Amino acid sequence: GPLLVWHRGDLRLHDHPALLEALARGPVVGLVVLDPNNLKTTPRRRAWFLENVRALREAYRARGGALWVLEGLPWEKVPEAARRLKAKAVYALTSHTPYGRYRDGRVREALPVPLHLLPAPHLLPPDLPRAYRVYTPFSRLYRGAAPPLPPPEALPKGPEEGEIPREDPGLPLPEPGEEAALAGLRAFLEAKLPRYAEERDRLDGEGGSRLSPYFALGVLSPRLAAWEAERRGGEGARKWVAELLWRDFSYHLLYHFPWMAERPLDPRFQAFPWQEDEALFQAWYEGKTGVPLVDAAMRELHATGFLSNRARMNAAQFAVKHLLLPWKRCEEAFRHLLLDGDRAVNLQGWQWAGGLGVDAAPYFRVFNPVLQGERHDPEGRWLKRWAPEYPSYAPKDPVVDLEEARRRYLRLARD
Numbered sequence: 152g153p154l155l156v157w158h159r160g161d162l163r164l165h166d167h168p169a170l171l172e173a174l175a176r177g178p179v180v181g182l183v184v185l186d187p188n189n190l191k192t193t194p195r196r197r198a199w200f201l202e203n204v205r206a207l208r209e210a211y212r213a214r215g216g217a218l219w220v221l222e223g224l225p226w227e228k229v230p231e232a233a234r235r236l237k238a239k240a241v242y243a244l245t246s247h248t249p250y251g252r253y254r255d256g257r258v259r260e261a262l263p264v265p266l267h268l269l270p271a272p273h274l275l276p277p278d279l280p281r282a283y284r285v286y287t288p289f290s291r292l293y294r295g296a297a298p299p300l301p302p303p304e305a306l307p308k309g310p311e312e313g314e315i316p317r318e319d320p321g322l323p324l325p326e327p328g329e330e331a332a333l334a335g336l337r338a339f340l341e342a343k344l345p346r347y348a349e350e351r352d353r354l355d356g357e358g359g360s361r362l363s364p365y366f367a368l369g370v371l372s373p374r375l376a377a378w379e380a381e382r383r384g385g386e387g388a389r390k391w392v393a394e395l396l397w398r399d400f401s402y403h404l405l406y407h408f409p410w411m412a413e414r415p416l417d418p419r420f421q422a423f424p425w426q427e428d429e430a431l432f433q434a435w436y437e438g439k440t441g442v443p444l445v446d447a448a449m450r451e452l453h454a455t456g457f458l459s460n461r462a463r464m465n466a467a468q469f470a471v472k473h474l475l476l477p478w479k480r481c482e483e484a485f486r487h488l489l490l491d492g493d494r495a496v497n498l499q500g501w502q503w504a505g506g507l508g509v510d511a512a513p514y515f516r517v518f519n520p521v522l523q524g525e526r527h528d529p530e531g532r533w534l535k536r537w538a539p540e541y542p543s544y545a546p547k548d549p550v551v552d553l554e555e556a557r558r559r560y561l562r563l564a565r566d
């Protein structure tokens with residue numbers, strides 16, 4: 152009987168504990184279940200997922216192995232695959248998300264054979280005992296990346312089943328799959344890593360790796376990335392790895408403070424006068440606020456599904472501090488437009504850029520839409536690409552009075 156390796160947010164063969172744990176015991180067959188709880192989202196994200204699932208199968212085939220793809224509820228499809236294959240056991244990577252736990256508990260209940268869950272690779276586990284709300288103390292626990300596990304050279308033969316739907320992303324998608332991700336990592340490390348600390352703030356984000364869409368679906372292991380970067384060493388690597396840690400910190404936060412999905416980490420904001428004005432929401436959502444920077448960010452986001460970190464913190468804080476739009480609605484809409492949309496990470500980003508309690512970031516910090524755009528975009532090349540209509544980062548008929556908007560917020564916050 153074979154062993155089933157059930158892939159979830161880990162569409163890769165490199166550094167995969169569940170794959171190697173099963174392979175060491177006997178022949179394996181891979182499995183992906185197209186779950187409605189995950190796929191009932193926007194076309195761009197659904198396609199990104201499906202195309203990376205298609206790539207994993209090609210990766211299995213290239214090695215002579217078999218990847219089954221089934222559609223439906225995990226607690227019905229996993230047991231079905233196990234029965235049909237007469238699998239002895241199922242192996243997967245542990246998930247600590249609310250849905251992940253519910254799902255796996257349900258699957259364990261319906262499965263007649265063992266479900267073995269192994270720790271997913273992280274720089275720092277999210278289920279650490281101590282619960283930190285600040286980054287520095289959390290990051291100190293990190294003592295360098297452990298070595299990544301190797302991918303199999305070849306896979307045992309097995310029967311293949313299931314078809315992989317083709318969805319219209321509505322936009323240009325990056326190259327899907329692990330090979331593309333690995334090629335991207337090498338390019339970044341050799342070319343951009345050295346100056347990362349000095350270029351990581353550009354509004355166009357060309358100083359970054361642009362690997363978030365891959366990390367989001369586990370096409371690239373963070374442990375492998377950290378390991379490679381640290382092999383290069385230097386200020387660049389230290390800084391880039393620090394950002395990988397911010398991702399783990401995001402999972403750590405949501406795991407220890409589940410309620411932050413519902414309310415701000417900082418209690419003294421639980422009752423902020425969020426003015427829900429449908430008219431303003433659309434202006435922001437469509438990037439029609441009249442503010443060069445924000446409009447540029449939202450426009451690129453709608454067209455590409457990607458946005459540099461600097462742009463995200465600008466477009467995000469603008470909505471929360473200036474327009475006072477409720478964060479909950481804005482964060483969901485933001486996530487749905489991102490190819491790398493990750494609930495935990497997006498939530499930390501919003502509660503951080505929105506001065507809602509993450510890393511005890513100060514509320515009094517308020518970005519200056521025009522300065523920001525000039526200090527992080529030289530010949531205004533970025534602005535000229537997403538909002539040519541604007542001659543500069545100067546407000547041309549703003550949906551609100553920046554100056555008053557600032558005073559307004561600071562006033563509200565101060566109390």
Ligand SMILES: Cc1cc2nc3c(=O)[nH]c(=O)nc-3n(C[C@H](O)[C@H](O)[C@H](O)COP(=O)(O)OP(=O)(O)OC[C@H]3O[C@@H](n4cnc5c(N)ncnc54)[C@H](O)[C@@H]3O)c2cc1C
Nearest residue numbers: 359360361362363394395397398460467491492493497500
């Ligand atoms: C309001 C807001 C929302 C965000 N939502 C998401 C989201 O849904 N999904 C997502 O992947 N990232 C999110 N980020 C974090 C971040 O902006 C990206 O990970 C980054 O822009 C990816 O570009 P890159 O791959 O070139 O990053 P690089 O600079 O090359 O960094 C490498 C990796 O480190 C991680 N990383 C970098 N910055 C951060 C950060 N601030 N927090 C957590 N991890 C980080 C990412 O995995 C990234 O791929 C958000 C940030 C903000 C301010």
